[PDB]
């Protein structure tokens, strides 16, 4: 790890002169609370059936999206205190912090 960076790295290799890898690109996520899988190490909670999360049957996501998410597009509500550029910086932000891959 170098001496007197006048400028940044790119991949972020060395912001942490101590744990160089830290904050870096293509290293894995951090977990502020253990991971909760259905086997305990690698199977989606809603994976096998009759498998209960914690005494309750894992609810389908299409169905939650339907029962609490659904709405009559006609009854929208303009946020009169903020403009879209607000919802569009959210992305410009997400888009700078995280991204997790899938495999083609």
């Amino acid at each position: 790890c170098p001496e007197q960076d006048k400028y940044r790295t790119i991949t972020g290799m060395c912001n942490n002169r101590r744990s160089p890898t830290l904050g870096a690109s293509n290293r894995a996520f951090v977990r502020w609370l253990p991971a909760e899988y259905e086997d305990g190490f690698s199977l989606p909670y809603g994976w096998t059936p009759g498998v209960k999360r914690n005494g309750f049957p894992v609810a389908l996501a299409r169905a939650v999206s339907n029962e609490i998410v659904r709405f009559p597009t006609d009854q929208l509500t303009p946020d009169q205190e903020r403009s879209l550029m607000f919802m569009q910086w959210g992305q410009l932000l997400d888009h700078d912090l995280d991204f997790t891959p899938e495999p083609a």
Partner: protein, 462 residues
């Protein structure tokens, strides 16, 4: 293959449908899902964690890149002119457009068989999602080719790497400063901010600057901010006429729309004149993205908020009472306790039947359904969860403009004069802009000002 297929099998983890779908009427179908890539293939003791391709720093990655084969490929390397490479042949009004990607499965081409407008190459692999998202990438692509230029005017013998590197700094700096000053405090509250963003004493070599797996889901709270259409206005700020409001569906991956249908301006602004959507428990997220997510490029259109909960199981995150607990907040263990918390008997009785226990409701769900915070727009869960990650990128980043060795005092001075509106002023064809705290002023007779009522930089100080 998971696009064309429904088996529950490896790369895949599909979304089964229910009995009474609105869009999807066949119980043998699914909205597709390729699960997230592990940090250790072939492990049997490792607890499954997922990777992050990007950089957590508020470096300006989406414009610059986070991998270095990519990166070299975005600069123009003929001259010594430090510069982001532009569209070889298809430009704005003599204003840069993004390059083009070279991709083996260009979705943005599936939108208009007829036109050749592929995906734009740039910092992030997904800047073609919304023409309203690509547009910003352009604007940032811009200030870069611009700063580089003017610096070339204040320091000649300065090479390419240095004219670009200096410029790069100035940018990640604009995006940092603007996100910590004029965006966050409206997307979090006043308070949250006093509990999460105390002021910047200095940098702490012992702050964990990386991105939390959860934030990954918590940040998608913004999914509730999105509006059914794409609005583009004429120089007078009314109803702009190739065609005003295009539904959010004919816009997914729509590069032609930018090139052929009428500049970056008409959107960049109108983005600026149209009230953002407002979240409330009776309008969580909408169909334009509940039932049409990417559908002109996919086989069936995703259900956003559904990939969300499903993406959450994928990551293997804990439910809503763990984080409720992780943050110092109360943990309702009853429908009764539930209303007390999200002031909504009706949704509590709802959430509770979906999920049995409040302890098993998906963060997204719990997150987004909490009453908004005063003067902000996030629950006490998400405020905590969003407020703390942001608190650490700042304090655990040795390149935060306010650190005392990055930019000089002198430099910093004008550096805190940078405002997005001007950014969207110097770089676009637009005259009249929206006032300070772009994010907070939809209105347009005024809720805007002119381009002289806005300061500039002082590369002088470079």
């Amino acid at each position: 293959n998971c696009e064309t297929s429904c088996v529950q099998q490896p790369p895949c983890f599909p979304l089964k449908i229910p009995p009474n779908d609105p869009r999807i009427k066949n119980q043998a179908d699914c909205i597709p899902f390729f699960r997230s890539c592990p940090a250790c293939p072939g492990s049997n003791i490792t607890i499954r964690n997922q990777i992050n391709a990007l950089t957590s720093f508020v470096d300006a990655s989406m414009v610059y890149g986070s991998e270095e084969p990519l990166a070299r490929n975005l600069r123009n390397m003929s001259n010594q002119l430090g510069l982001l490479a532009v569209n070889q042949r298809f430009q704005d009004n003599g204003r840069a457009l993004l390059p083009f990607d070279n991709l083996h499965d260009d979705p943005c081409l599936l939108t208009n068989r007829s036109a050749r407008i592929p995906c734009f190459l740039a910092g992030d692999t997904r800047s073609s999602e919304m023409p309203e998202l690509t547009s910003m990438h352009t604007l940032l692509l811009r200030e870069h080719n611009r700063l580089a230029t003017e610096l070339k005017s204040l320091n000649p013998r300065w090479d390419g790497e240095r004219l670009y590197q200096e410029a790069r700094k100035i940018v990640g700096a604009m995006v940092q400063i603007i996100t910590y000053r004029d965006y966050l405090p409206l997307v979090l509250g006043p308070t949250a901010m006093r509990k999460y963003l105390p002021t910047y004493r200095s940098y702490n070599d012992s702050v964990d600057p990386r991105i939390a797996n959860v934030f990954t889901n918590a940040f998608r709270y913004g999914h509730t901010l999105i509006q059914p259409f794409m609005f583009r206005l004429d120089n007078r700020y009314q109803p702009m006429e190739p065609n005003p409001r295009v539904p959010l569906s004919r816009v997914f991956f729509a590069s032609w729309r930018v090139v052929l249908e009428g500049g970056i301006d008409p959107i960049l602004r109108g983005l600026m004149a149209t009230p953002a959507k407002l979240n409330r428990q009776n309008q969580i997220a909408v169909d334009e993205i509940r039932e049409r997510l990417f559908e002109q490029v996919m086989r069936i259109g995703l259900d956003l908020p559904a990939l969300n909960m499903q993406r959450s199981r994928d990551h293997g995150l804990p439910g809503y009472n763990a984080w409720r607990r992780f943050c110092g907040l109360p943990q309702p263990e009853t429908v009764g306790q539930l209303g007390t918390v999200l002031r909504n008997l009706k949704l509590a009785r709802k959430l509770m039947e979906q999920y049995g226990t409040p302890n098993n409701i998906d963060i997204w769900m719990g997150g987004v359904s909490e009453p908004l915070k005063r003067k902000g727009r996030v629950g006490p869960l998400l405020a905590c969860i969003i407020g703390t990650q942001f608190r650490k990128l700042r304090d655990g980043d040795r390149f935060w403009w306010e650190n005392e060795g990055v930019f000089s005092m002198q430099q910093r001075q004008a550096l805190a004069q940078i405002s997005l509106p001007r950014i969207i002023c110097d770089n676009t064809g637009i005259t009249t802009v929206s006032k300070n705290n772009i994010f907070m002023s939809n209105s347009y007779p005024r809720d805007f000002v002119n381009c002289s009522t806005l300061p500039a930089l002082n590369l002088a100080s470079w």
